Amino acid sequence: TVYHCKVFQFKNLQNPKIRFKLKMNSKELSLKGLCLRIRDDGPGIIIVVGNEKSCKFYENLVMKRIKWNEDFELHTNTGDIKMDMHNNSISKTWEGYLQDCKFKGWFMKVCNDQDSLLRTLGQFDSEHFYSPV
RNA sequence: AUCCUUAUGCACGGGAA
RNA sequence: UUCCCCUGCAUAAGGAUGAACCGUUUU
């Protein structure tokens, strides 16, 4: 059993509407994998492992349907904040086939440094999908 | 998960024998 | 007690298609 796989990378993920869309669409499509980023305000990586149709649909999702370029408003304990998303982007670094994924479920972490991010990818032998910095 | 159509069961109202 | 009509609830069959402020996971 081999599974389709895609790998993406984003400059910023702070918009909760997105992060919601990401998690929900991962579980609803039975995609395995993960989504990481270095610190809340950081850039990171998405990996989706699944059947073709799910991965193509999710690709269409992240690429075509979600507009990461548009600014938003972060509701806060203190009051709204004008959140600048004009300098955001998402691209696909990989796609192909994987013999077996040590990926169990799907989750969305936030790593301290880049090293922690690597190691986290190193649990699942995927560090090789990260184009650092 | 939502809409519509068909079939069945239960409850209420109106009319006939 | 039977028949006819309207409204509400549950089950089954068939056809068509969306949203959702949320982080190691609550198919």
Author numbering: 335 to 467
Show sentences the authors wrote:
Here, we showed that Prp3 orthologs contain a C-terminal U4/U6 di-snRNA binding region that encompasses a DUF1115 domain and a preceding peptide rich in basic residues. Our crystal structure and targeted mutational analyses demonstrate that the DUF1115 domain acts as a ssRNA-binding domain that specifically recognizes the first 10 nts of the U6 3′-overhang. Our results indicate how Prp3 functionally bridges U4/U6 and U5 in the tri-snRNP by Prp3-RNA interactions on one side and Prp3-protein interactions on the other.
To elucidate the molecular mechanism underlying U4/U6 di-snRNA binding by yPrp3CTF, we determined its crystal structure in complex with yU4/U6stem II+10nt at 3.25 Å resolution. Residues 335–468 of yPrp3CTF and all nts (G81-U90) of the yU6 3′-overhang were well ordered in the two complexes contained in an asymmetric unit. In both complexes, the single-stranded (ss) yU6 3′-overhang arches across helix α1 and strand β5 of yPrp3CTF, running below the long β3a/β3b hairpin. The yU6 3′-overhang can be divided into three sections, between which its backbone changes directions on the surface of yPrp3CTF. Nts G81-A83 (section 1) stack on the terminal U80U6-A1U4 base pair of stem II and run diagonally from the N-terminus of helix α2 to the N-terminus of helix α1; nts C84-G86 (section 2) are positioned perpendicular across the N-terminal end of helix α1; nts U87-U90 (section 3) run along the exposed edge of strand β5 and the C-terminus of helix α1. As a consequence, the end of the U6 3′-overhang is directed via two ca. 90 ° kinks back towards stem II. Notably, the unusual doubly-kinked RNA conformation is stabilized by protein elements that expand the core ferredoxin fold in yPrp3, that is, the β3a/β3b hairpin, strand β5 and helix α3 (details below). The guanidinium group of R353 (helix α1) engages in hydrogen bonds to the Watson-Crick face of C85 (atoms O2 and N3) and to the Hoogsteen face of G86 (atoms O6 and N7).
